[PDB]
Structures are given as structure tokens and as C-alpha cells.
Amino acid sequence: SIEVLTGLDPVKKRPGMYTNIENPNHLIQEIIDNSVDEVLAGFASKINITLYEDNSIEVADDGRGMPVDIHPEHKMSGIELIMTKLHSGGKFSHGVGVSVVNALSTRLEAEIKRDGNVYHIVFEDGFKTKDLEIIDNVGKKNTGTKIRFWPNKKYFDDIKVNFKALKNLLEAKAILCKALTIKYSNEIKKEKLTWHFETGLKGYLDHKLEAETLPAEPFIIDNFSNGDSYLDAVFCWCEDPSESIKNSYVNLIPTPQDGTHVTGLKNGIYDAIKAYIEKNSLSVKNIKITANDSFAQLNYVISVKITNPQFAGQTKEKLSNKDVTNFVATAVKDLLTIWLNQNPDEARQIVENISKVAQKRINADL
Numbered sequence: 530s531i532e533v534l535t536g537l538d539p540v541k542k543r544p545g546m547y548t549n550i551e552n553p554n555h556l557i558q559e560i561i562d563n564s565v566d567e568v569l570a571g572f573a574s575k576i577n578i579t580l581y582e583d584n585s586i587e588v589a590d591d592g593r594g595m596p597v598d599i600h601p602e603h604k605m606s607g608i609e610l611i612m613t614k615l616h617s618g619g620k621f622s623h624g625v626g627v628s629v630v631n632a633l634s635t636r637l638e639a640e641i642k643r644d645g646n647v648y649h650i651v652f653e654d655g656f657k658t659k660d661l662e663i664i665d666n667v668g669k670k671n672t673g674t675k676i677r678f679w680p681n682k683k684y685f686d687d688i689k690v691n692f693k694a695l696k697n698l699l700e701a702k703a704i705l706c707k708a709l710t711i712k713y714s715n716e717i718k719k720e721k722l723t724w725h726f727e728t729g730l731k732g733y734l735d736h737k738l739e740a741e742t743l744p745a746e747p748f749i750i751d752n753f754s755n756g757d758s759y760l761d762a763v764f765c766w767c768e769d770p771s772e773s774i775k776n777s778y779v780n781l782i783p784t785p786q787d788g789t790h791v792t793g794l795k796n797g798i799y800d801a802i803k804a805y806i807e808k809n810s811l812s813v814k815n816i817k818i819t820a821n822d823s824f825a826q827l828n829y830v831i832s833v834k835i836t837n838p839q840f841a842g843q844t845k846e847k848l849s850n851k852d853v854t855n856f857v858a859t860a861v862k863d864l865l866t867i868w869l870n871q872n873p874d875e876a877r878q879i880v881e882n883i884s885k886v887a888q889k890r891i892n893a894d895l
């Protein structure tokens with residue numbers, strides 16, 4: 530509806546607006562986000578990161594490979610177009626685009642494999658400096674995008690990549706993609722890692738809580754969907770040592786301010802505690818349970834993968850997609866019920882505990 534294309538001068542002259550200027554970690558994030566799009570779209574399964582001793586970063590993936598076709602209107606390869614311009618848009622007047630990286634880099638290189646050609650192009654301070662050419666050939670099914678870049682010292686407090694932060698980030702990302710394998714190679718500290726979580730979130734709560742949780746084997750929703758689309762979640766009840774694990778994600782973007790997906794998980798848990806209480810007549814007469822009680826001592830991680838993530842206001846901190854709320858709800862209800870119906874011992878230990886919670890709340894009302 531409103532598409533906006535500009536040059537890179539805005540970014541160059543307000544870096545703090547388009548990246549965190551402490552170090553290049555964010556620049557790397559932006560490129561991982563792009564690989565991650567291909568992983569979410571189902572075309573990619575690898576993201577490989579090398580940190581070189583010259584302080585450049587290289588991020589590679591086995592995705593479809595950045596487009597190379599000449600834009601009928603802009604007269605320029607897809608890849609050049611994305612690289613040498615800010616793209617933005619909306620309905621009326623991060624996800625800032627890789628051209629931010631290009632801009633704040635002294636040198637950036639891209640190597641693409643599509644259609645059995647290997648393409649190459651170099652840029653400097655965000656301007657093309659060597660034409661897109663075919664430098665090799667490759668099997669038709671050998672595809673991907675590979676970018677290496679030399680952040681430009683003048684923009685950053687420090688050019689040194691904060692290593693620990695990146696590794697944490699990469700671990701966080703793999704956990705949320707059982708289909709993804711992330712290799713990482715720091716040539717400066719001579720160290721390599723590989724993350725592959727075939728298992729998924731399974732174990733994470735066990736590990737991060739290491740207290741007695743209920744259920745003892747926290748509840749897994751493994752890759753539930755319908756094409757509306759994808760729910761992974763893990764949850765259990767526990768108690769304090771301030772061990773708040775309450776994490777939520779859309780398309781791997783942290784939602785520190787919750788929304789439709791979180792709401793959805795709150796409802797469906799309630800929904801199926803109500804339904805289970807009634808089914809077995811586990812009521813007590815002046816203890817009407819509420820949605821908040823079933824949630825009070827809940828520890829969880831919910832990660833949602835959806836086609837059109839609409840957010841709240843200016844930043845991508847809260848998910849506002851009306852209708853994930855009932856997509857997350859229906860699943861958690863049915864899914865949890867089945868477990869409840871099969872788990873007398875723990876299902877009733879859970880209800881009794883939520884009753885204590887509601888009971889204690891009702892008391893505090895004078």
C-alpha cells in the first residue's frame with residue numbers, strides 16, 4: 530500500500546536508530562534473521578557462522594539463495610536492490626533489512642547459489658564495487674546465500690563481537706527449531722560449536738528450574754499446527770525461588786510484552802482445568818477458580834510460528850494477531866485434557882494446588 534525505497538545515508542548518519550552501536554552483534558542478528566526467514570519458510574536447515582581474525586563475520590545458509598533477477602522497474606539485480614537500499618512500507622503513514630549491514634560495513638561480500646550458478650558481488654560503504662558475476666557452477670540442488678562483512682570501525686564503540694552473547698542467541702534460536710542445525714566457528718579463540726535440538730524445548734524447564742515441578746515431566750506441545758500455523762510450547766507448575774521462566778516468541782522474535790499467543794495459553798489452560806474439575810466434580814463451594822489462578826504458578830515457554838505477524842504500536846514486543854488467541858486456546862485445551870484424563874495422580878495434585886491459589890486469593894479479599 531505504501532512502499533518506500535531510499536539510499537543508505539539515513540542509516541550512516543543515524544546508526545543508533547538502525548542498529549546497536551556497542552558492537553556488531555546486532556548486525557549479525559539482522560543477517561541471522563534473514564537466514565531464519567528461510568528456515569521458517571521451510572527452505573533452510575543450516576545456519577553456519579564464522580568469526581574471522583580480521584573481525585569480519587560470515588553467516589551462511591542452505592536456503593533458496595537471494596534473488597538475482599533484474600528488477601523490471603529498478604534495473605538492477607534483486608540482490609543489489611536489497612543490498613544498496615533501505616526498504617520500508619506499511620498500510621498508512623527489528624526488520625530493518627540487510628542493507629543496514631552493508632551500510633555500516635567497510636566491505637561486504639555475498640555469495641549466492643541458485644540455478645546451479647555460484648554468483649558473487651562485492652560492496653563497500655554500501656556501494657557496489659564489483660559487478661554481480663557467475664564465478665562457478667554447482668548442482669541445481671546445491672542452493673544458499675553466504676554473506677561476509679567487515680563492520681566499519683567508525684560506527685561502533687567496539688568492533689569486537691561480544692562472543693558470549695552471540696552463542697547464547699544462537700542456542701536460543703536452535704532450541705526453537707528442531708529442524709535447524711547451527712554451526713559456529715570463532716577463529717579468534719579457536720573454538721567451534723554445533724547446536725541441534727532434535728528434541729526441541731524438551732528438558733529446558735527441567736534444566737532451568739531444577740526444583741520440583743508439576744507435572745514432574747513438564748508438559749510438551751511438539752510442533753502442533755493446522756497451517757494457521759505452528760505451535761510449540763512447554764509448561765509446568767512450580768514455586769518461586771524467583772525462577773520466573775515465562776518466555777514467549779513469534780517467529781522467533783521475543784515478545785517481552787506477551788499478547789494473543791500468551792493470552793491463548795492462559796485461556797486454554799483455564800478452559801481445561803474448568804472442564805476437568807467439572808468432569809470429576811472436583812469443585813469446592815466458596816472457591817470459584819479463575820483464569821489467573823491456573824496461571825499463577827505456571828512456568829512456560831511458548832513459541833508460535835505464523836504467517837502474518839501483526840504487532841502492537843511501534844515495537845515488535847507484543848503479538849496482536851487476533852485469532853492466534855483461539856488457535857493457541859483450542860490446542861492447549863484438547864492437548865492438556867487428554868493428558869489430564871490419563872494422569873489421575875498428577876491431574877488432581879494440580880487442581881488441588883490451583884484451589885489453594887484461588888483460596889488464598891479469596892481470603893485476601895476483606
Ligand SMILES: CCc1[nH]c2nc(Sc3cccnc3)nc(OC)c2c1C=O
Pocket residue numbers: 559560561563564567588589590592593594595596611627674675676
Ligand atoms: C545469510 C543471510 C540471508 N539469507 C538469505 N536467503 C534468502 S532466500 C530468498 C528470500 C526471499 C525470496 N527469495 C529467496 N534471501 C535473503 O534475502 C532476501 C537472504 C539473506 C539476507 O541477508
